Write a protein that binds this ligand. Structure first.
Ligand code: SF4
Ligand SMILES: [Zn+2]
Ligand SMILES: [Zn+2]
Lengths: 732, 155
C-alpha cells in the first residue's frame, strides 16, 4: 500500500486492468484523464510487479512526449519508491533510466554550449569515434574525451549504480562518478528494471534499435500520452528534400572527390584491404555505437540491414555510382516540380528507367556511404549531414515506394515558393511504425486521457481486447466545468470554418466574450484558435474596433510567434508574470507549440478558451492523400476521421490546466457546432457529471452567468471535502 | 556549360540560356545551332574523328542533360548490349559474385582500357538467340488482360 493521496476509489479499477493483460497477452487501451492521479496511482502498482519473483521475465520501458515530462515521471516514481521502501522495510534495488541523448550530453566546455543537438553531437562523435578511432592515440587531435576511456575501464569492470536518476543526476554524476549518458546508458541498459524515454525512438523505422533482447513474446511496454499516434507513425518515416539541402549536398560531394584524388598508391592499398574484411565478416566491431547515429535499421517491419556491400568493387568506382544518383535526381526532381502531379509509380518506375541499375545497390547505398568515410575517417559529421538526407530518401524507394505516394506542391500550395521547392513523401496506413513494436514485445499498454472515442480506434488495424473507460468517483463536482457557447436564436454567428475577413459578426463575438472573462478569471487564461490564418485576422480586426486595446488594461498579452527561438523566451515571460504579478493571457493555436506539453497548472493558467472547432485544412493535397487511402479500408468512415482529429486536439488543450484535483480548471467551447457531438466522441465522465445539465445552447450573455457558478462555488472547498480512505483504502 | 566547348559556331551558348542541345552515338554534345550549320556546309561528320550521321539519331533536349561526359557514356553502353545480359546470366549463376564483374567492366570501359575488343567478340559469337523482345511481349499481353478484367468489374 502507498499512503499519499486520498482514496476516491481509483487503484481498485487499475488493479483489475493490469491482471487481464498478462492473461490475454495483447495490446490494451486504458483511459486516464488528467483529472485523475495517473502517476501516483500508477507507480504504486508498478513496483509491486518489479518485485515479481514468480514472473520469470518482467520489464518496463515507459515513455513520454516531452523532455520535462521525463523528469516529472522520474520524481513521481522517486517518492512511491520512497514510501513503501520505508513500509516494506528491507529494500531491493532498482533502476529507472531516463535515456536522454543529444540535449543532455557533454560535460566538455568546448562542446556543450552550442545551441543545437545533432550537429554538436556530430562534433562529439567525430572527435570520439572518427578522429580518436582513426588517429587512435596522439596528443591534440585525439581530444580529452577522458571519461569515455573511464567507461572503457568500468565497462571492463562491474559497478552497481543505486536507483532511478534524474537527467541532472547523471550530469552531476558526470562530474563525480557517473559516466556519459550514452555509455553508462549502454552499461545500464545491460540491466535496467525501468527505462524512461520518448516513444519517438521506437516509433521510427530508421535509427530504432528496440533496446531489447531477442525475445519476441516477453517484456512489458507502457506508453504515455499516445493519443496522437496517427501522425507520429507517418511523420517519423516521412522524408523530404529541398533545393537548399540539395545544393549543399552537391557542394560537399565535390570535397570528397578531392580527398580520393590526392591519394597516391601506398595509402590507396589500405582502403581496399578493409573491403575484403567487410564481405567475409558480418559482426564488425563498428556496429556497437556508430549504428545508432547513422541510418540503423530502415527496414524495421522486415529484418536487419546487413549485406555484402553490393554496388561497389573499388573505392573510386563507388563514387561514380553515387554521383549518378545525384546528377540524375536533380534532373528528375526539377522537371516534375513544374506542374502538380501525384502518382506513386511515376517516381518508382521513372527512376529505374533513367538509372539502369538494380534495386540492391540503391537499397544499401545508405549504409555503404557511412562505411566509406570509416576507412579514411578524417572527416566529420558536419560535412556528412547533408549527404545523409539524400541517402535516406533513396532508401525509402527501393523497398517502400510500393505503398506510399508523392505529393508535388510547387506553385503556392502550403509550401515555399519557387525560391525553395520541396517534395513530399509520407505514408497513409499508420501501422508500419507500430507493427514491429507489438511483435518485438509481449503486450503494450497505452495511457491517454484525451483518447475517448474508441469507435475510430481500429484505424491502426490492431486488436485491443482490454477496453475500459474512467469515471473517477468524486463527491464535489467543482473540479471542472465544461461550457459550450453557440449564441443560438440571437445571432447564430459564432462559427467560421471557411471564412476569413468577410464578416465582422463572429470576430466581434470572440472579443466581447474574451474581454468579460479577463476580469472574472482569478488567474491566467490559456486560449486557443483554429489556425494561423484565422488567428491573425481576428487580432488585426480588434485594432480597428478597439477590442484588443481594452484587454491590455487588465492582463498581459502573449501571442505565439513563428520562429522557435522567440517561442521559448515568450513562455518564460508568461510563467514569470503569472507567478509574481497578475496572471496574463495566452492567444495561441490549438496545434502550435504551447499545446504539445506545457503542463501549466493553477499558478500558470487555469482557464481554457476554445475559439471554434480546431479542424484541419483538408483542401491541401498533403493531407487528402492520407484520407483517400482510408476509403479502401473504411468507406463510411470518410467523415468520422476528421471529427476524431478535431476533438482530439480540442481535448488536448483542455486536459492540461488540471493535474491532481485541487487545481480547479475551466474550459470553454465557444462554438455552436458542439450540439449533438458532445454525446459521442467526448469524455465519458463529462456527459454524466457535467454535460447532463442544460448548458450547451448558451450565448455570450448567458455564458458569463453560468461561468460565475464555477468561480463562486470554488471558494467553499477550503478546509476539508472528499477525504475518504484514512490512509488504508477504507479496509477494502 | 561553356567549359565543354562547341564545334562549329562556338558562339551560341552565350546567346540563349535555354538552348536545345543534342547528342549523338560516338559520344559528343552538339547544340541545335551546329546541326543546321554543319548540314549546309557538309553533312554528319564528327568534328574530332570520323563518325557518320545519316539517320535522325539526335536526342533534342533543352534541360541540359549531358552535364558530365563520364556519367552519360555509362548510361548508353549498358542500355545497348548489357541490358540484354540481365536475363541470360540468372539462368546459369547461383550467387551474387559474377554481378560485380558487370558493374566493374563498365566503369573501366570509359577510362580507356584495351579490354574493349574482348566484349566485341562475344556479340559476334552466336547468331541465334533473339529473346529479350519476346519477354517484353508477354508483359504487354498480361497488362492488357488486367485492364480488360478491371473493366469488366466496373461494368
Ligand atoms: S562522449 Fe560523453 S563526453 Fe565524449 S563527447 Fe560525447 S558526451 Fe562529450
Ligand atoms: Zn554550337
Ligand atoms: Zn569522335
Amino acid at each position: 500500500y502507498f499512503p499519499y493521496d486520498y482514496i476516491y476509489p481509483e487503484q481498485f479499477s487499475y488493479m483489475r486492468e493490469l491482471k487481464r493483460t498478462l492473461d490475454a497477452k495483447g495490446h490494451g487501451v486504458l483511459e486516464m484523464p488528467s483529472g485523475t492521479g495517473k502517476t501516483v496511482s500508477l507507480l504504486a502498482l508498478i513496483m509491486a510487479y518489479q518485485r515479481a519473483y514468480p514472473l520469470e521475465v518482467t520489464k518496463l520501458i515507459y515513455c513520454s512526449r516531452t523532455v520535462p515530462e521525463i523528469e516529472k515521471v522520474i520524481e513521481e516514481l522517486r517518492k512511491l519508491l520512497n514510501f513503501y521502501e520505508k513500509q516494506e522495510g528491507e529494500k531491493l534495488p532498482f533502476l529507472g533510466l531516463a535515456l536522454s541523448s543529444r540535449k543532455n550530453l557533454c560535460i566538455h566546455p568546448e562542446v556543450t554550449p552550442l545551441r543545437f543537438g545533432k550537429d554538436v553531437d556530430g562534433k562529439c562523435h567525430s572527435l570520439t569515434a572518427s578522429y580518436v578511432r582513426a588517429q587512435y592515440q596522439h596528443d591534440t587531435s585525439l581530444p580529452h574525451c577522458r571519461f569515455y576511456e573511464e567507461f572503457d575501464a568500468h565497462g571492463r569492470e562491474v559497478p552497481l549504480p543505486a536507483g532511478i536518476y534524474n537527467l541532472d543526476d547523471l550530469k552531476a554524476l558526470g562530474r563525480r562518478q557517473g559516466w556519459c549518458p550514452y555509455f553508462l546508458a549502454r552499461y545500464s541498459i545491460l540491466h535496467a528494471n525501468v527505462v524512461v524515454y520518448s516513444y519517438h525512438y521506437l516509433l521510427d523505422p530508421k535509427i530504432a534499435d528496440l533496446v531489447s533482447k531477442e525475445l519476441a513474446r516477453k517484456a512489458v511496454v507502457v506508453f504515455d500520452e499516445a493519443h496522437n499516434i496517427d501522425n507520429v507513425c507517418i511523420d517519423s518515416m516521412s522524408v523530404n528534400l529541398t533545393r537548399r539541402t540539395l545544393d549543399r549536398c552537391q557542394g560537399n560531394l565535390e570535397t570528397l572527390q578531392k580527398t580520393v584524388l590526392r591519394i597516391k598508391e601506398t595509402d590507396e592499398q589500405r582502403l581496399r584491404d578493409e573491403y575484403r574484411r567487410l564481405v567475409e565478416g558480418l559482426r564488425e566491431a563498428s556496429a556497437a555505437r556508430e549504428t545508432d547515429a547513422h541510418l540503423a535499421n530502415p527496414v524495421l517491419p522486415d529484418e536487419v540491414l546487413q549485406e555484402a556491400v553490393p554496388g561497389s568493387i573499388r573505392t573510386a568506382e563507388h563514387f561514380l555510382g553515387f554521383l549518378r544518383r545525384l546528377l540524375e535526381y536533380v534532373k528528375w526532381r526539377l522537371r516534375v516540380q513544374h506542374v502538380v502531379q501525384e502518382s506513386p509509380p511515376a517516381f518508382l518506375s521513372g527512376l529505374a528507367q533513367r538509372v539502369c541499375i538494380q534495386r540492391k545497390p540503391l537499397r544499401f547505398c545508405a549504409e555503404r556511404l557511412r562505411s566509406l568515410l570509416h576507412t579514411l575517417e578524417i572527416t566529420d559529421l558536419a560535412d556528412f549531414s547533408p549527404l545523409t538526407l539524400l541517402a535516406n530518401f533513396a532508401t525509402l524507394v527501393s523497398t517502400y515506394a510500393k505503398g506510399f505516394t508523392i505529393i508535388i506542391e510547387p506553385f503556392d500550395d502550403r509550401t515555399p515558393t519557387i525560391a525553395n521547392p520541396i517534395l513530399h513523401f509520407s505514408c497513409m496506413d499508420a501501422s508500419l511504425a507500430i507493427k514491429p513494436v507489438f511483435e518485438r514485445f509481449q503486450s503494450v499498454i497505452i495511457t491517454s486521457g484525451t483518447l475517448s472515442p474508441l469507435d475510430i480506434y481500429p484505424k491502426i488495424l490492431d486488436f485491443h481486447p482490454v477496453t475500459m473507460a474512467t469515471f473517477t468517483m468524486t463527491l464535489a463536482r467543482v473540479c471542472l466545468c465544461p461550457m459550450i457557447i453557440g449564441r443560438g436564436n440571437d445571432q447564430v454567428a459564432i462559427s467560421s470554418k471557411f471564412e476569413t475577413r468577410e464578416d465582422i459578426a463572429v470576430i466581434r463575438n470572440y472579443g466581447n466574450l474574451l474581454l468579460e472573462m479577463s476580469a472574472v478569471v482569478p488567474d491566467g487564461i490559456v486560449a486557443f484558435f483554429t489556425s494561423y490564418q484565422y488567428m491573425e485576422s481576428t487580432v488585426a480586426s480588434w485594432y480597428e474596433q478597439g477590442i484588443l486595446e481594452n484587454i491590455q488594461r487588465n492582463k498581459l498579452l502573449f501571442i505565439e510567434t513563428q520562429d522557435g527561438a522567440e517561442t521559448s523566451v515568450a513562455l518564460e515571460k508568461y510563467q514569470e508574470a503569472c507567478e509574481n504579478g497578475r496572471g496574463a493571457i495566452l492567444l495561441s493555436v490549438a496545434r502550435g507549440k504551447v499545446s504539445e506539453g506545457i503542463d501549466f497548472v493553477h499558478h500558470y493558467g487555469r482557464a481554457v478558451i476554445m475559439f471554434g472547432v480546431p479542424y484541419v485544412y483538408t483542401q491541401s493535397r498533403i493531407l487528402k492523400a492520407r484520407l483517400e487511402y482510408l476509403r479502401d479500408q473504411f468507406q463510411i468512415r470518410e467523415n468520422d476521421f476528421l471529427t476524431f482529429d478535431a476533438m482530439r486536439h480540442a481535448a488536448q488543450c483542455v486536459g492540461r490546466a488540471i493535474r491532481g484535483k485541487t487545481d480547479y480548471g475551466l474550459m470553454v467551447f465557444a462554438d455552436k457546432r458542439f450540439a449533438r457531438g458532445d454525446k459521442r466522441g467526448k469524455l465519458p465522465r463529462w456527459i454524466q457529471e457535467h454535460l447532463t445539465d442544460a448548458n450547451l445552447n448558451l450565448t455570450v450573455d448567458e455564458g458569463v452567468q453560468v461561468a460565475k457558478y464555477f468561480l463562486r462555488q470554488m471558494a467553499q472547498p477550503f478546509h476539508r471535502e472528499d477525504q475518504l480512505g484514512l490512509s488504508l483504502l477504507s479496509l477494502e | 556549360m561553356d567549359d565543354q566547348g562547341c564545334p562549329r559556331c562556338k558562339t551560341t551558348k552565350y546567346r540563349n540560356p535555354s538552348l536545345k542541345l543534342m547528342v549523338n552515338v560516338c559520344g559528343h554534345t552538339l547544340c541545335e545551332s551546329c546541326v543546321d550549320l554543319l548540314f549546309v556546309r557538309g553533312a554528319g561528320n564528327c568534328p574530332e574523328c570520323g563518325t557518320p550521321l545519316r539517320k535522325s539519331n539526335f536526342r533534342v533536349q533543352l534541360f541540359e542533360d549531358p552535364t558530365v561526359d563520364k556519367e552519360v557514356e555509362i548510361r548508353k553502353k549498358v542500355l545497348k548490349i548489357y541490358n540484354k545480359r540481365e536475363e541470360d546470366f540468372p539462368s546459369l549463376r547461383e550467387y551474387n559474385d559474377f554481378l560485380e564483374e558487370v558493374e566493374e567492366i563498365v566503369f573501366n570501359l570509359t577510362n580507356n582500357v584495351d579490354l574493349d575488343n574482348t566484349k566485341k567478340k562475344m556479340e559476334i559469337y552466336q547468331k541465334e538467340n533473339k529473346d529479350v523482345i519476346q519477354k517484353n511481349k508477354l508483359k504487354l499481353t498480361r497488362e492488357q488482360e488486367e485492364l480488360e478484367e478491371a473493366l469488366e468489374v466496373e461494368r
